[PDB]
DNA sequence: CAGTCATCACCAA
DNA sequence: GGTAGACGCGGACATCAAGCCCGCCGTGAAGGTGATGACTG
């Protein structure tokens, strides 16, 4: 017995791209005609500040770009002069059936595969899941620079059935931490309601609206875009700010980030706060790798002992297995 | 040379007479030059020369398959014929070995270099634009019949295409200068049309046999 | 071994905002809640060649008659109005915190040796002697950048935001306070040990700094003044374009933000000269000259490498300029 | 004891 | 609900210096042919 050459899971936990406005604070419950924070395309006289190399450092040109300025063009966006709110609203759609894959060559590991996940569920079910991305909701997380010294974030949480609404929620996102997962009974409600999607017993669609204080004409941080295969003169734009018409806006895939960062058990450094849900626990921008392949905690080695020769791990680390169940990926070799 | 995907090693040994002397068509007929280097007695010296002449003679019988093509073609004044057509591997050879040389090569790209060092006195290179590539086989292409000594699968084919299948968006709306400065229809096609009419204005009628039908149908 | 990370980034402290522009009668200064913006004005205008003049296409006839014709330019203003003579500049400022740690790093143990260089600065020397020049730069208006010089009366009044509504309030006289000398007293220091909290991650910190300048009537302000490049226009249709917002003259925030760091008394020319803004290997570009090289080896690039790699701690007046420099931000690496 | 069905090495810039 | 008959000339359009660094670019499946080898009815 093999796993397959061929796995493609689904993602489950599906959000769209969240686009951005500006207001005032007590017009926050009529926030439905804010108009958007736009994109500004600007020139920037600045100064050569990086290290110098000496590898052709000739005094002639080197020594003499330093005393001379240095000309870039960036993208910004600010808040009005007149609002002081940044708003953010996308939709999240939570799927179910979260351990079927929808492409596999063999049948016996299909059905090793299900019965497996259904082990996993018919003791336990997706709750302590659930609540974690319930906390990662109830926090203000998928606004990542944005509400980085805000002095106060409100983040409303709709759940929708047609055109009305069926159950609205209300909290206050700077109580709730990053590093913990404390919670109380109004979380709970939400938890239950997602894992109620997860475990394919109803259709949950919700609509997240997130409200920062921040200052009048302050920046907010768009998602930057990545221009990647350029091959160009000087840096004609060194930074683009990603907008759909006239809003600026954040990728679908940040804010999908932000809510699957709930993997605290890691090995090295799990009382140093939740990282995302990887198969190999990278965290890129911070350069290393918790869950190496050498330390047996990877998602390549446990799903590998739990499905195929019944070693079944600790439950602490069948959260992560079927947390990178719920965010999908080819797992084939 | 088509046959069997894994007996297609011994056809370099028996193709290689080919190389070096002129002693290809020795093997079979004119065994004077696969007696003396050969070193084989006449039982393998006759089984050489008679095995030899099963490559371009005849290797089966001469059939079909429901996978071929076999198109109809209407006769003038009674029924049909069927007509199954072949890969011309042979033409397709050569054309892929003309192609080669003149999209890359010495003189296309050295033609090409001159041009980058904006000195260039005239010769000829050539350029193909717009083709396009299809695989015969897949990742392996030896049981298919050679495609495989430069070819490696990869016939080039020539573009065909309509003119007119990458158009643009109409739009003449009511504009302050898409009104009434959209009276001249500003195109991106015509700048071929319009350079043509001016560098072909300069010439005199000292070669001008060919350049006075041009104009009419301009 | 620990050899530097090859991607750094530290995100700034002290964001500014564009600061804008109004206009109004002094003495009406605490009324001044709607006083009309400063617009910015096209005109056309018809100088003389006051230009020098090449001579590759040098002829008796060509430069005499383009010396004797006109010129003609265009070109944009901004004034204060036929019966205002206060200039009115008004911006907010955000102090962060958590100056010492990168947003993003490769090398982890290089990250926890920054983090603990930084930490061992800050508990034996707060923020404060930062702070407090900060504070000045907030206290007279540098910010004020050629709109200050010749004015008559200065006038700062910096609230503290933590609501709605202002819950602290300062009035300066930028004037009194100079350009030259950190001399503090007893008004100056709680808007510096509110900025050293702030910046230390003790509370939140915004500001509303509004400052009013007497000029005159009718007298020309000084918006800031933006690069239209990478082009190559034809016929060079505006010689000069001022930024604005929406019908309002105004500030780059960089600027503004330019100004609140002219910090820099420890470079080794001189200090009675004056401060520069933090910035490694630092130059005034205005000038020409580039102040701490990298030859005489006290540029930022050098004192921070020998200070976190090596243990070599610099002087203590350098330590300030380093840790200027992380609040500051920018991008570190290879070589 | 003879057709037929899954596998098996054979090649290959 | 009135035609009527015309719209100017000349002249000129700025010069200077400068344009960033660092890391990285995914995996799985896409072969026909005889030749025994095992099955064999």
Redesign the pocket.
Not at chain 1, 5 to 8: E, G, I
């Given at each position: 017995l093999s796993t397959a050459?061929?796995?493609?899971f689904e993602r489950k936990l599906d959000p769209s791209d969240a686009l951005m406005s500006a207001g005032a604070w007590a017009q926050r419950d009529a926030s439905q005609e804010w108009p958007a924070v736009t994109v500004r395309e600007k020139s920037v006289?600045?100064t050569?500040?990086?290290?110098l190399?000496t590898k052709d450092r000739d005094p002639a040109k080197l020594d003499a770009?330093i005393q001379?300025?240095?000309?870039?063009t960036?993208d910004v966006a600010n808040l009005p002069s007149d609002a002081d709110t940044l708003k953010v609203r996308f939709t999240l759609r939570v799927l179910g059936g979260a351990g079927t894959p929808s492409?596999c060559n063999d049948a016996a590991y299909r059905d090793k595969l299900l019965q497996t996940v259904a082990t996993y569920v018919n003791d336990q079910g997706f709750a302590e899941l659930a609540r974690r991305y319930a906390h990662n909701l109830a926090n203000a997380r998928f606004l990542w620079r944005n509400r980085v010294g805000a002095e106060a974030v409100e983040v409303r949480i709709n759940h929708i059935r047609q055109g009305e609404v069926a159950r609205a929620w209300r909290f206050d996102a700077l109580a709730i931490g990053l590093r913990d997962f404390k919670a109380d009974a109004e979380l709970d409600a939400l938890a239950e309601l997602i894992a109620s999607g997860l475990s394919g017993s109803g259709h949950v669609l919700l609509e997240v609206v997130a409200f920062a204080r921040i200052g009048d004409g302050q920046e907010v941080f768009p998602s930057q875009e990545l221009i990647?295969?350029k091959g160009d003169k000087?840096?004609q734009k060194?930074?683009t700010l990603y907008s759909v018409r006239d809003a600026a806006a954040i990728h679908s895939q940040k804010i999908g980030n932000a809510l699957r960062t709930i993997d605290t058990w890691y090995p090295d450094e799990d009382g140093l706060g939740p990282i995302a849900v990887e198969p190999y626990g990278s965290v890129t921008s911070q350069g290393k790798a918790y869950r190496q392949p050498k330390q047996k905690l990877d998602f390549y080695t446990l799903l590998d002992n739990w499905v195929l020769r019944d070693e079944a791990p600790a439950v602490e680390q069948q959260h992560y297995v079927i947390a990178n169940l719920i965010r999908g990926?080819?797992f084939?070799? | 040379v088509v046959?069997?995907?894994?007996?297609?090693?011994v056809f370099?040994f028996l193709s290689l007479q080919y190389q070096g002397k002129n002693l290809l068509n020795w093997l079979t007929e004119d065994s004077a030059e696969a007696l003396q280097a050969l070193s084989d007695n006449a039982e393998q010296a006759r089984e050489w020369r008679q095995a030899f002449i099963g490559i371009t003679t005849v290797k089966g019988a001469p059939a079909s398959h429901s996978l071929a093509k076999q198109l109809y073609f209407p006769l003038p004044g009674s029924g049909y014929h069927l007509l199954a057509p072949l890969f011309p591997t042979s033409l397709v050879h050569h054309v892929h070995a003309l192609l080669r040389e003149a999209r890359f090569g010495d003189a296309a790209k050295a033609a090409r270099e001159a041009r980058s060092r904006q000195e260039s006195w005239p010769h000829g290179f050539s350029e193909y634009p717009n083709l396009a590539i299809q695989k015969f086989?897949?990742?392996?292409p030896?049981?298919i019949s050679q495609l495989?000594?430069?070819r490696?699968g990869e016939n080039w084919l020539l573009p065909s295409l309509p003119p007119n299948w990458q158009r643009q968006n109409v739009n003449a709306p009511m504009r302050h200068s898409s009104v009434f400065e959209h009276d001249f229809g500003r195109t991106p096609e015509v700048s071929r049309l319009t350079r043509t009419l001016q560098r072909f204005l300069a010439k005199t009628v000292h070669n001008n046999l060919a350049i006075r039908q041009r104009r009419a149908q301009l």
């Open positions: 050459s061929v796995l493609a006289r600045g050569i500040s990086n290290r190399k770009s001379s300025p240095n000309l870039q960036v492409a990647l295969d000087k840096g060194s930074k990926g080819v084939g070799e | 046959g069997n995907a894994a007996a297609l090693d370099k086989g897949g990742t392996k030896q049981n495989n000594n430069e490696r």
